Amino acid sequence: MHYLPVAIVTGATRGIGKAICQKLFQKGLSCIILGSTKESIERTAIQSGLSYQRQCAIAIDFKKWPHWLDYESYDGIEYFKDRPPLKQKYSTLFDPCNKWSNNERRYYVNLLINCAGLTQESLSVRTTASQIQDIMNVNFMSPVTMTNICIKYMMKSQRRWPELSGQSARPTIVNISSILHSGKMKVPGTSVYSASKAALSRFTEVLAAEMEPRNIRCFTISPGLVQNLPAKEMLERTIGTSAPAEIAEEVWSLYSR
Amino acid sequence: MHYLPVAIVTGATRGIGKAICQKLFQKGLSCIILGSTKESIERTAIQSGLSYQRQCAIAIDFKKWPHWLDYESYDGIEYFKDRPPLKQKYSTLFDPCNKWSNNERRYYVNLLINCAGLTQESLSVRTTASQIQDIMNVNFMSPVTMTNICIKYMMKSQRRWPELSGQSARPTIVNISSILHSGKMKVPGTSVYSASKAALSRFTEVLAAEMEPRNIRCFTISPGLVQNLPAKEMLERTIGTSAPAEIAEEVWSLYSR
Ligand SMILES: NC(=O)C1=CN([C@@H]2O[C@H](COP(=O)(O)OP(=O)(O)OC[C@H]3O[C@@H](n4cnc5c(N)ncnc54)[C@H](OP(=O)(O)O)[C@@H]3O)[C@@H](O)[C@H]2O)C=CC1
Ligand SMILES: NC(=O)C1=CN([C@@H]2O[C@H](COP(=O)(O)OP(=O)(O)OC[C@H]3O[C@@H](n4cnc5c(N)ncnc54)[C@H](OP(=O)(O)O)[C@@H]3O)[C@@H](O)[C@H]2O)C=CC1
């Protein structure tokens, strides 16, 4: 049997998540990309790799947490180099792996990147309750559920295909935190954004302590540049930067090395 | 006019929040205490101070975030030294102040303690979605809304009673964070608990940067002892402590000095 690693990358329709995905594909993994709508994943779907490499996109709105855990199917699209996009309906996040696998080949998820992110540009007292709900559902609650759904999958896959150990990278989770999550960079306009980033970082550090003995690696990356503007320009000017290409490379570093 | 400071203390029906409240009353403030149910606030309602000092309790279930923002009234009880508890219905959190104020006296909130807390004792992968929702709604979302409702109140009160400056403590918010929110203490079983504490801490640090120039002081306190048990006993034994009496004192220190 040939086991072929797949990565799930949330927030991959554009920005940092798009860089990360390009790297991973360049480096030999198949990709399952997440976007928020049918429209945004149709947009990404319009890159030459090994013949067995595959790419698809799934539409999940992270604001709709926790209801999206219970959707029977998800709208998805498989896309290609030199062949038009294919409408799909996937029963789970791992359904694309099932459909790619054949008598000779087993596709399986071995890497999850939580990169989907919603921003904030308003003072705490001027930020509504639903805005705070959206930010936490996209930046924290959903990433937690993604992480947990994947860890269940990763552990069960490890028990059922024991040969994977020593012939694979260890199942890896990488959550994208922000420089704003701690220290000097306390930027007005971003109180709940930063907190959600603080939550994701801290969740991952504690998860890593739970997971490391079970041989799932859990990392966080903490980047910070391209907002503004979110009072705030005074600190953002007073005080470094990050490239999406640089972050994609660090993600690969963490997985491969 | 005599302006008389009132404190709102969430999570004050027992534990640390009860210590904090006793201190504040000992030190001359009137108290509005929060509990989660009609029953728990009835329980607290069954302490000799100045004649003008007052105490009441209000029932708000922090799991019901964000719906509790919209309740028309809240069940409350006013209690006394040597006089039986009085059933109340309060239109807002500041309604008790309105009812205590008289031609000679003005009661107003000048201190908010977010001390209400829900714990976690399960591994991430073994913690359901609703459990994670409860923890974040009680430990983070609700405290954020409390903080914002109070800051609106505090700013408007400052504009309408300008004499308060120089004759008062500055309007103060104290959020109770936990040693678990950062650093060495990464305890299995507590991933979302710790994250919510991380979120509250970080939110408050950024809020303080927003608020300090508007003359609202925003502090966090980070205590850590009495859980267990939440794998976990190995770290909790390997590595200090905090007394509720010690924390009550630190809260008073922060407000008075
Ligand atoms: N910009 C910066 O300087 C820094 C950013 N970061 C973080 O890195 C991450 C990458 O984003 P960034 O590179 O900045 O570029 P973008 O913010 O432009 O990318 C945002 C991504 O989030 C997805 N998303 C937004 N809303 C939802 C939703 N409701 N449900 C599901 N997915 C959603 C988007 O999908 P869709 O296309 O469908 O909208 C999109 O893929 C973020 O988490 C961000 O906070 C960290 C440090 C610095
Ligand atoms: N225990 C420890 O060692 C440490 C605790 N802390 C933190 O300090 C805080 C104080 O709690 P603690 O002293 O430990 O004692 P308790 O946990 O026994 O007190 C819990 C309080 O939270 C309130 N609460 C629980 N659920 C809800 C809800 N759904 N809605 C509104 N209120 C609710 C309770 O009200 P009710 O009576 O109605 O249930 C109660 O007043 C917590 O935030 C905690 O995380 C920090 C460091 C260490």
CATH number at residue B63: 3.40.50.720
CB pairs under 8 A between A and B: 136
Annotated binding site of B: 13-14, 16, 36, 40, 44, 61-62, 72, 117, 120-121, 193, 197, 225-226
Looking at the complex, report in whole angstroms how far the Cα of residue A190 sits from the nearest Cα belonging to chain B. Answer: 7
B202 and A190: CB-CB below 8 Å? no
d(CA A135, CA A194): 10
Q: Is A177 a catalytic residue?
A: yes
What's CA A55's distance to the chain center, in Å? 15
The type of residue at A44 is: T
What residues 3-42 of chain B have any CB closer than 8 A to a CB of chain A? none
| Residue ranges making up the domain that contains B239 | 1-257
Q: Is B197 a catalytic residue?
A: yes
Between A125, A202, A209, which is nearest B182 by CB? Answer: A202
Report how many domains make up chain B: 1
Residue A72, φ and ψ in degrees, nearest 5: -70, -45
d(CA B144, CA B146): 5
Q: Is A197 a catalytic residue?
A: yes
Distance A68 CA to ligand 2 centre (A): 30
> Which H, E and C letters describe chain B, residue by residue?
CEEEEEEEECCCCCHHHHHHHHHHHHCCCEEEEEECCHHHHHHHCCCCCCCCCCEEEEECCHHHCCHHHHCCCEEEEEECCCCCCEEEEECCCCHHHHHHCECCEEEEEEEEEECCCCCCCCCHHHCCHHHHHHHHHHHHHHHHHHHHHHHHHHHHHHHHCHHHCCCCCCCEEEEECCHHHCCCCCCCCCHHHHHHHHHHHHHHHHHHHHHHHHCCEEEEECCCCCCCCCCCHHHHHHCCCCCHHHHHHHHHHHHHC
Q: How was this structure obtained?
A: X-ray
Of all atoms in ligand 1, which is nearest to the CA of residue A116?
Answer: 22
Residues A225, A241: contact at Cβ < 8 Å?
Answer: yes
Sheet of A55-59, strands arranged across: A86-90, A74-79, A55-59, A30-35, A2-9, A105-114, A172-176, A217-221
Please name the residue whose Cα sits nearest to atom 16 of ligand 2. B15
> Which H, E and C letters describe chain A, residue by residue?
CEEEEEEEECCCCCHHHHHHHHHHHHCCCEEEEEECCHHHHHHHCCCCCCCCCCEEEEECCHHHCCHHHHCCCEEEEEECCCCCCEEEEECCCCHHHHHHCECCEEEEEEEEEECCCCCCCCCHHHCCHHHHHHHHHHHHHHHHHHHHHHHHHHHHHHHHCHHHCCCCCCCEEEEECCHHHCCCCCCCCCHHHHHHHHHHHHHHHHHHHHHHHHCCEEEEECCCCCCCCCCCHHHHHHCCCCCHHHHHHHHHHHHHC
d(CA A129, CA B69): 9
CB contact burial B156-195 (16+ within 10 A = b; e otherwise) = ebbeeeeebeeeeeebbbbbbbbbbbbeebbbbbbbbbbb
Token pair in block for residue B160: 């309408």
- Reported as half-sphere exposure (CB side, CA atoms, 13 A), residue B199 has a value of 29
Resolution value (Å, 1 decimal): 2.3
| Torsion of Cα atoms, B38 then B39 then B44 then B45, to 10° | 60
Report chain breaks in chain A, C–N > 2.5 Å, as residues after which they occur.
46, 226, 230, 239
Backbone angle region of A149, left / alpha / beta, with phi > 0 → left and psi within -120 to 50 → alpha: alpha
A231 and B208: CB-CB below 8 Å? no
